[PDB]
Design a protein around this nucleic acid. Structure first.
Lengths: 150, 117
RNA sequence: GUCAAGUAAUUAAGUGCAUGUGGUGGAUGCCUUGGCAGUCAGAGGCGAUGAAAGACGUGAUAGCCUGCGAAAAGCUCCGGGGAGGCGGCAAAUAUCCUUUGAUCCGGAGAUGUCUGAAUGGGGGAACCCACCUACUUUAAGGUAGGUAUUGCAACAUGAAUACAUAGUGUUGCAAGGCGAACGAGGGGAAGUGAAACAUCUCAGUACCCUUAGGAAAAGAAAUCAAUUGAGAUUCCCUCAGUAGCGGCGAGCGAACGGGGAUCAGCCCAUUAAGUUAUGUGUGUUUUAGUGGAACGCUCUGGGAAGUGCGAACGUAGAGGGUGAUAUUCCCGUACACGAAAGGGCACACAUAAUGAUGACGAGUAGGGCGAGGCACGUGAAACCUUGUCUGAAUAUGGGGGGACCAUCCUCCAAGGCUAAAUACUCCUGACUGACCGAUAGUGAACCAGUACCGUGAGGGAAAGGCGAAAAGAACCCCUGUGAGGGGAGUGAAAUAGAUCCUGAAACCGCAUGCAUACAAGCAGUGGGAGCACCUUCGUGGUGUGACUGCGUACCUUUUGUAUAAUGGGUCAGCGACUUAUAUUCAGUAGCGAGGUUAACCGUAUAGGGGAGCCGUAGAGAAAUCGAGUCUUAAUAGGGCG
RNA sequence: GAACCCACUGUCGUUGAAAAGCCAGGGGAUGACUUGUGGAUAGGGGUGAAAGGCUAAUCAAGCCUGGUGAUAGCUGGUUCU
RNA sequence: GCUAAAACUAUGUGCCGAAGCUGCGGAUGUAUACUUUGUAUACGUGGUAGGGGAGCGUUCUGUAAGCCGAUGAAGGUGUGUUGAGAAGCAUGCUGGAGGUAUCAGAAGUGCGAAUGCUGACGUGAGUAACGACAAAACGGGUGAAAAACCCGUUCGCCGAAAGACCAAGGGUUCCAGUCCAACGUUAAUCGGGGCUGGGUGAGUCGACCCCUAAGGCGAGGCCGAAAGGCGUAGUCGAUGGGA
RNA sequence: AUAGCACUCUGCAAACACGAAAGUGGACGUAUAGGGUGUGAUGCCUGCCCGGUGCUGGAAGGUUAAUUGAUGGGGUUAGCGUAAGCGAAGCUCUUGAUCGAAGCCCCAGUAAACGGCGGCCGGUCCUAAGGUAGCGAAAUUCCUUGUCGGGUAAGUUCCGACCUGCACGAAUGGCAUAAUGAUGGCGGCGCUGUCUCCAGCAGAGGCUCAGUGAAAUCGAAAUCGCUGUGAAGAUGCAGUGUACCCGCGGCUAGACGGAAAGACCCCGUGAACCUUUACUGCAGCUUGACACUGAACUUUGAGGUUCUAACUCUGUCCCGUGAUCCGGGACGAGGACCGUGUCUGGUGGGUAGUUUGACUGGGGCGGUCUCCUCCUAAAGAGUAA
RNA sequence: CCACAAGUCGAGCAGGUACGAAAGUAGGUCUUAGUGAUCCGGUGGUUCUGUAUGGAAGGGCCAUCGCUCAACGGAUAAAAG
RNA sequence: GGGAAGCCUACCUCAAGAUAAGAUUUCCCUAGGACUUUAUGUCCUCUAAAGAGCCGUUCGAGACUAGGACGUUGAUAGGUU
């Protein structure tokens, strides 16, 4: 805090409580007692623990019937209405779409849809797998995730 | 996450001041004095919940003594006579009867002195 | 009816409690043209062609702020844009400008007083006094240019002193000052710890001085290693709190080897890579901008974006605003276009110049004396620097491998240049936050480094909020043509009426109900009559409390406190066990005789990266052995396993 | 013995008219005198007919800013059930 | 207050008397059996320094483009009600736009004290005091209001300063009109107060200028790790000389 | 402080002081001058001691530094040896003979240098020497209000004198002294409200009314006396006595009243400043060795004589130049000295950083601090002052 | 016996001894006081180590020496008011 | 029975807040309605006594108060003689 170098008044004789600086944390306008600094909040996760958690999440989704397997999922043109109809026929209005590769047309079509996101097979994360109501997965993506074992 | 204390602190102080209603001067206006006053009131209540039983037993014994001496007995002799006669009516009911029904108390005293004889 | 005894009711000068209604005061809640910390990408300077920082002027009205400079809220040209505009506090008003294209936005020019390195001399900064040229005036002046010092170069001139040199002058060129952090170099403490203190530590830290660049420094082995192997410099992870140093105290603390980031070498007189300027060419980026989809009805309401019912766009459901909560009302967003003129960066050519007084390194290596640096404090002390005194050989030669000698291995000093990986943020653009929300966050959200204090260096505040829109209360009344209020009127709301959202507490009034003027103390607590109001009429509710038993505050510190031991006038707001790293133990989860990665790469919480760490075997000072080992002559005994 | 320069006694004043004074008396008053303007000496230093006196109401080592959040085996305080 | 006691000695029969014991209702810790149980039985439940266990509230992040809200959120102020507690819930009035379940996550997470910090307001108390004991009185005027302003008639005080000038220092305080909220230790129509407008005229007065003292700076120069010290020629510097 | 007095240093580029140096003051002075130290007009004067510390002068005897490096002993390898082992030279580790100054030890002088001027019963011991003049119950005398005289009715003060001076004394001056002093003590005249013993009066406050309007303090108060109890001196506890509610003018006995985290005392392994023959450094001063540093003749490694060319001059003249700086040149006087750098011995409260124990019927002074035996010690062990 | 660091008693086993004919006795003295940790150095020995290698210097291990550190569990090599 | 400057009376002053609030003399007030909480009941109209005070002139009484005298039917104060 700016200033505060000098003793405000002498140690004895004035009748006041003794003080050393006008920027003491007791005083209004003084420094904070334990001042914070920038922090790093990342934790370490064991590789095996992460992979096991992903496996458990996928198995729970399967046995809860929130994972929908589809042979092929492609879009003809970058059209939000076309994508919306394609998801509505599958009954997956709120969904995360996982594909072996991310087609630019599909990405552009999905960008503006609320509660719809599209990811590559190698970019799935545990929070995304849980947040969405359904996960629509292609067979090729399922095979790659199989090879990676979650 | 900076936390302000105003709402909770105000609620606590207001509850203490509400419990301090009716006291004299600063005891019902000033938080420090009011807070000291409420604790002392609680301590007094705890002690007096024990003192009350003794005070009421003393009152009953005095009234029974008056009735017995009206009927020609002392309190101790009347109690001993009732114990010997096996009557187990307690002092609260005995004092109530002494206050409100002279004839029944006279009958009880007759029973006690008959057992003493 | 008189008299006499006994015993009720009736007063409030003032006060207490409760409730109602106010005042003062400015907490709380909600909010934000202000802060804090970062990521990505730039940039890393300005100045004698006069800087940073200031003084004074400049307006129809002109005090302050902003802009500008006697051409003075502006002038000229080029480009954009298409209906308002004459900067803000700050309304009104006037004169006005503008589709013959204003205001406004971007680029390039013109002008640019005085002080300040200030540079014609001087000086108490914003002032005083000059000289010389050219033109101009006829009076006592005006215009423009010039007139500092130091260093270098050329020229001229020139003493003691004969040649000369010193000195002196003219011309041309260059430098000085300022500013955040980072770099390099010259000097360099003490508080503190060691539970005292002097060696030591703190620490080459704080501070002072000089001086660069966008980075700097270092750098191509007279280097390490010890299987005869590696191969310039810099930075990160390990090795490792190990080997060592140390009043062997407190403490200080490596290297070798391994894993990464980045990778690059070139010359000493005919002389290289590289770097810096100038011009040209090509490519990219940047300094204004243009277009840019799609909503209706009904209910509540002051107001609809809110309820209910249906519809449309989406490469656009980011954000902001509009009278309450909007993808379809406005500005915008995704996307697609766009530059007269100027700037940056990249690559390639031409010319300069530099590299580049230097051609294999002598007062040098080594030595005696005193110091300093190396993790290393004189130690068994190698190696580096040198204040003083000395002093080689020179490839059949010389340096090193931690005292010293021999053998081996390795390198060639006494001459130079060199990018990247690394360090930082005065500043610019965009974006972000389990950061703050007016006692917080910068000292400063507001005309703040201001008011104020000090001779001076210096120190250093407080102060945000009417309403959607001023629609900011015409007119009447009391009053001093005042202040203040009462009506009327505006507004959804005026107890939103100007220091105006909400309006808590301390503190101070008025009103009603009950108690209170014969009675002694932490002011309550357990009982308890009477009264007033309400009432489901009650074994009910609210207020009060005659009379009565018991009863000497709180905190701290102490053997022990009502203590006449400490602290507190009261209220509201703020105020004290945290953060990073290492280690040990306990829970819990994964894997399990195995477990786990670090730096780093990676459009990146994934996936790679096995160097390293812990566990799996002890004994011994150690060499050495090993389910054993040490001691011993001992296979005895015994200690650790 | 006036001006001027001092400060020996007493009363008052002591939240003063005043952070050193007023009143009544007192000393020197041509000298080692008093005084204006402008200069010099700077902190382990200055100056001192010497009291550790004075050096901006501060002196057995001035003031300001930094080291600095010095250290304190001492005192105080430490917030819901 | 007490004397064949209400004193002392000895004996006896009753009674009073504690938060001790018993009775009735409720809560909780540990252990043993029911071979989950939340159930019975048994033994426990005063506590400073300390150790252990379990919870309540506050701010922010996800869940949350969800749920509540102008038919009224947060905040403020009453009332009723629930739990063993920190606390929870419902609703009248005020207020006028936000709030946030559940389960996880992170903390600027709880104040009565530190002669603690900032602001506001009390008690003393309508108390002390209103700053030289040179001194005032009356008539008229103006004005809402006159002991204090203006005019007039009397009285008193200074007169080597309580009068008249200059330097330093200050900076509009000078003059006129107008106003009285704040300032003036009272009121004020008055003012050194607010507002508006005026006012400073030099060859001879002073400054500037010429000249120098103490002293300062100082081309070259001497000296010093750097910064710098001293100093020659010069150049400044009045408190002095020059119409 | 002072005029006067004394001691001492200083030969001029003075001693001394400031400054890192250049340089500046001393001083534009020259021993009748300048610095330091003590005493303090004047009159009479100023005794004894040189053992100690200091200062001055000698000595070349003993001790001692850097420098120098004679001897002795190890390490290593050519080679000689069956082996053990031996082992030159060369490098290297160590040992340290000889030379070597000042200082110190030693010998004298010095007190207007710092200092000293006794003991124990006439005597004796011991000293370096044992107080001269003058003065003395004093600015010095504990005992002490010593004793005597004067003053007073009565005098712990005053004056005179005496002298068993606890513990005067001659330039840290002795004894006096005219004049002088807002100087200390004592006694008189006049005078008085200083007092016996206070009274009256005048002005300014106090008090009342109108206007403005503070302060320190403060846990909360429905805030009596007495005797007792009690963290040991009670408004608040126990017993008892007294007392209707509330102001105003006075008063200061209590509220251990207000004010300032006691300054006395102790403690902290706190602070600061001052002193010294406390410890350890440094500045300053001083000695020798090496360098700057040369030549020619002599004597018994050292000493001497001479020279000039290094170097010095706060000496003269000339030039830059209009100049008491500075530089160059010419002279003159010195001269291998002086002086400076590195190394080294000595001195060094000038200056700096620090240390200087604890127990303890408070602290200090005294005593104690580790080990063995007995008692206290209560019939096992252990048990404090 | 004991906070630690320390202290005390000890049968018996192996080797080499002395005295006794022998069974045997002897690891100082009737016992309990006669003492000083660590660090740093000195001397003797050693089938330990030895910074490229062979040596060496230095270090280790075993035995032993230098304390009125007496404020005697011993703050420094070195300290009064 | 006697018996002291000592005790209670006696002398002077205060004294019924002596809540136990005492005593004596003298003086004053003798009207109508409405209603319900049917009671020393509350509201209207009429009435206002004996006295006390405010105010004024003042005091040998006085800080302010209190106390004493007087207010035209009058000597209370000033003036006048």
């Amino acid at each position: 805090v700016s200033g505060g170098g000098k003793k405000p008044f002498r140690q004895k004789g004035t009748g006041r409580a003794r003080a050393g600086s006008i920027r003491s944390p007791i005083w209004v306008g003084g420094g904070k007692t334990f001042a914070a600094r920038p922090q790093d909040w990342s934790q370490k996760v064991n590789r095996k623990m992460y992979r096991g958690a992903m496996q458990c999440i996928l198995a729970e989704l399967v046995r809860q019937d929130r994972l929908v397997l589809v042979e092929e999922f492609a879009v003809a043109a970058p059209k939000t209405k076309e994508l919306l109809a394609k998801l509505n026929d599958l009954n997956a209005a709120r969904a995360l779409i996982v594909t072996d590769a991310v087609d630019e047309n599909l990405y552009l079509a999905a960008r503006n849809l609320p509660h719809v996101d599209v990811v590559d097979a190698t970019a799935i994360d545990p929070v995304s797998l849980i947040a969405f109501d359904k996960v629509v997965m292609s067979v090729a993506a399922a095979k790659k995730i199989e090879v990676e074992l979650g | 996450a900076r936390v302000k204390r105003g709402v909770v602190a105000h609620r606590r102080h207001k509850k203490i001041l509400a419990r301090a209603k009716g006291y004299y001067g600063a005891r019902s206006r000033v938080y420090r004095v009011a807070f000291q006053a409420v604790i002392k009131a609680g301590q007094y209540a705890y002690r007096d919940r024990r003192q009350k039983k003794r005070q009421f037993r003393a009152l009953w014994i005095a009234r029974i003594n008056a009735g017995a001496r009206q009927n020609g007995l002392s309190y101790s002799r009347m109690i001993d006579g009732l114990k010997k006669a096996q009557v187990i009516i307690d002092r609260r009911v005995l004092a109530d009867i002494a206050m409100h029904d002279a004839v029944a108390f006279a009958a009880l005293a007759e029973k006690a002195k008959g057992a003493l004889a």
